Structure formats: structure tokens, C-alpha cells
UniProtKB/TrEMBL annotation:
Residues with N-formylmethionine modification: 1
Name assigned to this protein: Bacteriorhodopsin-like protein
Organism: Erythrobacter sp. HL-111
């Protein structure tokens, strides 16, 4: 299961930029941990779970991008005569590795939105269950599709390009199911939210839809049969997706949770 990244040589700048993307992302998610810990204390008990879920996603994402940093360093070797980083035999890098921790990220990011919508008990657990089923199936089917991206990129000797489309389209169907669950949640918030909260919950849904939509775009980059430069672009695309979907979304959602907390008379949330 080699990703397109494995079949290319990288000049120092290309290799070093991608290395810094993984490292910077890891650092930013760890820093996010501090923000969510602090915000949790100023959030009403009934919405505090959302800040706690953001912390879980920060740790998941730090290990995700940390593994990519390690695999990137291990999978390529400096060739002095070429003045490039070249693929090491037996050591394979794949974006595919990031799919494992999506099994945490995807259901949790979706569920925390449902929490701030004000769903509790069975109503929350029914939605969490459906988002987890849809999310796991989305990721597992997507994983099968990306397995064949070399054939899609026209890497000599590689077949099964049709699998990329078959499983890609299956995954997209599961994505749409998650979006419809979440659309229903933000349209039907619990309690008596202000018009401002109603509007901000809808903003959070569309922000999730926008940032999540970057992942199928990154999945599709092998269609563009990229050079080392195209791979730099792809890993920048993933970095924008990761930081925006996990940390920026988390911060925006935490601020809606603070507003709901304040509206419901939680003093520490009003003071903040
Ligand atoms: C579930 C997973 C089954 C995936 C099977 C994919 C077979 C592809 C064969 C090929 O085209 O090379
Ligand atoms: C490949 C990328 C696929 C992107 C799919 C986007 C289409 C999403 C469909 C479901 C969205 C339904 C939105 C209903 C209104 C939401 C609201 O305002 O509450
Ligand atoms: C009125 C408050 C506005 C929102 C505050 C935003 C602060 C978020 C800081 C995130 C830190 C992550 C590290 C980078
Ligand atoms: C106002 C509240 C007090 C401030 C709390 C800020 C503390 C920082 C956040 C706590 C997280 C620490 C847990 C460490 C585990 C990190 C996992 C490492 C993954 C590589
Ligand atoms: C309540 C606002 C807190 C903002 C600072 C969060 C911590 C930033 C990273 C420091 C390490
Ligand atoms: C060599 C590849 C090791 C992959 C295992 C994942 C470990 C993640 C560690 C991240 C550190 C933060
Ligand atoms: C095939 C395996 C995938 C099954 C869906 C994931 C199960 C999670 C359900 C949690 C409730
Ligand atoms: C990795 C394979 C995942 C298959 C998902 C499609 C079927 C799931 C439900 C079966 C009934
Ligand atoms: C009633 C609403 C119908 C929406 C169905 C969405 C279709 C999913 C398409 C996925 C593949 C592209
Ligand atoms: C439009 C809603 C947010 C979608 C995510 C887009 C993230 C990138 C926005 C530009 C910021 C500079 C990144 C380079
Ligand atoms: C190449 C490095 C990329 C770093 C990640 C870039 C992060 C992009 C942030 C996009 C979203 C910005 C905030 C959106 C506006 C939210 C304001 C509150 C609601 C109006
Ligand atoms: C009001 C929204 C706050 C924006 C969050 C940005 C913090 C992470 C950006 C790192 C790049």
C-alpha cells in the first residue's frame, strides 16, 4: 500500500517543507490542548464534554502527524551525488496511516457538535452511534480506495485504478449520511438558544462540511499525477484540512459552547 509520495525524489526544500508541516501541526495540536483545558473550566457542565472531546482530538492529531513526521524521516535517505532525498527500499510512507486516527477524530468532531446542539442521554447516544457507524464505514471504505492511488497516478506496474472510484464514491455516500445527521442536529438545537446561538451552530455545521470536504480533495490529488512539487501542494492541503477541521473548528465550537453557557446563566462563561 505505497502512496504516490513513495515513488518520488525530493530536493532539500521540498523534503524540509513537508517535514516542517508535520512538526508544526504536531506542535499546534499540543498547544491547542492548553486552550481546551482552560476553556473547559469556564464552560457550563452540560457543554464541558465538547471541550474535553477537543482535547482527545488534539492528542489523536498530535500522534497522527507525529507518526507522519517519523515515517517521512525514516522512508527517505539523502543521496549526496543526487542532492535529493530518495525513497528507501522496504520503508514505505503512506498518507493512508492518517486514516487509523480518523476513527477517533471523525466520530468525536461530529459528536461534539451534537453536544453543543444540546442533545443529552439517549438522543445524544443515538446520534453518536449513527455518526460512529457512518464515520467508521466512511474511513474504512476510503482506506480501501486510497490503497490503489498509485494506479490512479499512472505509477508504472500498478493496477486497480477502478477501486479508487468504486470505494471513493462509497465513502462519499457515508460522508453525506454524516452531514445529514449533523444538518438535522444544528436545525433542531435543544433548550431555548438565542437566534445568535442558532446562527452560530449552523456556521459550525458548514465550517465542518467545508473543512471535511478538503479530505476527499487530498484523496483525489493522485488524479493530477503529481511531481515532488504536487506532493508538497498535497501535504499543504492536508495541513490546512487538519488544523482547520480539528483545532480551528474546536476553538469556534468552544466559543459557541461558552455563549450557550453564558445564556443559561453560567457566570464563569459570562465573565469570559
Ligand atoms: C473489502 C475489501 C475488498 C477489496 C478488494 C479489492 C480488489 C481489487 C483488485 C484489483 O483491481 O487489483
Ligand atoms: C466530495 C465532497 C462531497 C460534499 C458533499 C456536500 C453535500 C452535502 C449534503 C448534505 C447537506 C445538507 C444541508 C442541509 C442544511 C443544513 C442546515 O442549515 O442546517
Ligand atoms: C473572545 C474570544 C475569542 C476566541 C479566542 C481564541 C483563542 C484560541 C487560541 C488557540 C490556541 C492554539 C495554539 C495555536
Ligand atoms: C485554568 C486551567 C489550568 C490550566 C491547564 C493547562 C494545562 C495543559 C493541558 C493539560 C494536558 C496535559 C496532558 C499531557 C498529555 C499529552 C499527550 C502527549 C502526546 C504526544
Ligand atoms: C483562554 C485563552 C488561552 C490562550 C492561550 C492558550 C495556550 C497557548 C499555547 C501555550 C503553550
Ligand atoms: C517509525 C514509525 C513509527 C510509527 C509509530 C507511531 C508513533 C507516533 C509517535 C508520535 C510522537 C509524538
Ligand atoms: C465492518 C465493520 C464496521 C462496522 C461499523 C462500526 C461499528 C461502530 C458502532 C458503534 C455503535
Ligand atoms: C472495508 C470494507 C467496508 C465495507 C462497507 C460497506 C458495507 C457495510 C455494511 C454491510 C451490510
Ligand atoms: C433525501 C436526501 C437524498 C440525499 C442522498 C445523497 C446521495 C449521496 C451521494 C454520494 C455519492 C456522490
Ligand atoms: C470557508 C470556511 C473555512 C474553510 C477552510 C479553509 C482554510 C483556509 C483558509 C485560508 C487561510 C490561509 C491558509 C493558507
Ligand atoms: C500552510 C499552513 C496552514 C495552517 C492552517 C491554516 C488555518 C486556516 C484557518 C481558516 C479558518 C479561520 C477562521 C474562520 C472564521 C471564524 C470566525 C467565527 C465565525 C464568524
Ligand atoms: C475565533 C476563531 C479562532 C481562530 C483559531 C486559530 C487558532 C489556530 C490557528 C493556527 C494556525
Amino acid at each position: 500500500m505505497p502512496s504516490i509520495e513513495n515513488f518520488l525524489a525530493y530536493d532539500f526544500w521540498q523534503y524540509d517543507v513537508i517535514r516542517h508541516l508535520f512538526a508544526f501541526s504536531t506542535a499546534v495540536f499540543l498547544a491547542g490542548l492548553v486552550y481546551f483545558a482552560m476553556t473547559a473550566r469556564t464552560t457550563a457542565p452540560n457543554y464541558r464534554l465538547s471541550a474535553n472531546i477537543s482535547a482527545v482530538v488534539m492528542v489523536s492529531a498530535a500522534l497522527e502527524l507525529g507518526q507522519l513526521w517519523l515515517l517521512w524521516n525514516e522512508s527517505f535517505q539523502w543521496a549526496e551525488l543526487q542532492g535529493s532525498f530518495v525513497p528507501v527500499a522496504g520503508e514505505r510512507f503512506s498518507n493512508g496511516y492518517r486514516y487509523m486516527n480518523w476513527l477517533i477524530d471523525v466520530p468525536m468532531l461530529a459528536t461534539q457538535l451534537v453536544v453543543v446542539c444540546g442533545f443529552v442521554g439517549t438522543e445524544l447516544r443515538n446520534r453518536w452511534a449513527k455518526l460512529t457507524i457512518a464515520g467508521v464505514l466512511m474511513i474504512l471504505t476510503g482506506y480501501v480506495g486510497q490503497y490503489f492511488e498509485p494506479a490512479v497516478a499512472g505509477v508504472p506496474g500498478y493496477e486497480g485504478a477502478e477501486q479508487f472510484w468504486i470505494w471513493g464514491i462509497i465513502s462519499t455516500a457515508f460522508f453525506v449520511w454524516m452531514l445529514l445527521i449533523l444538518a438535522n442536529a444544528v436545525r433542531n438545537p435543544q433548550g431555548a438558544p438565542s437566534d445568535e446561538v442558532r446562527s452560530r451552530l449552523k456556521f459550525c455545521f458548514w465550517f465542518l462540511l467545508a473543512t471535511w470536504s478538503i479530505y476527499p480533495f487530498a484523496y483525489a490529488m493522485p488524479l493530477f499525477a503529481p511531481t515532488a512539487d504536487g506532493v508538497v501542494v498535497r501535504q499543504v492541503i492536508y495541513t490546512v484540512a487538519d488544523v482547520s477541521s480539528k483545532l480551528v473548528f474546536g476553538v469556534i465550537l468552544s466559543q459557541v459552547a461558552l455563549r450557550r453557557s453564558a445564556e443559561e446563566g453560567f457566570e464563569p462563561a459570562r465573565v469570559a
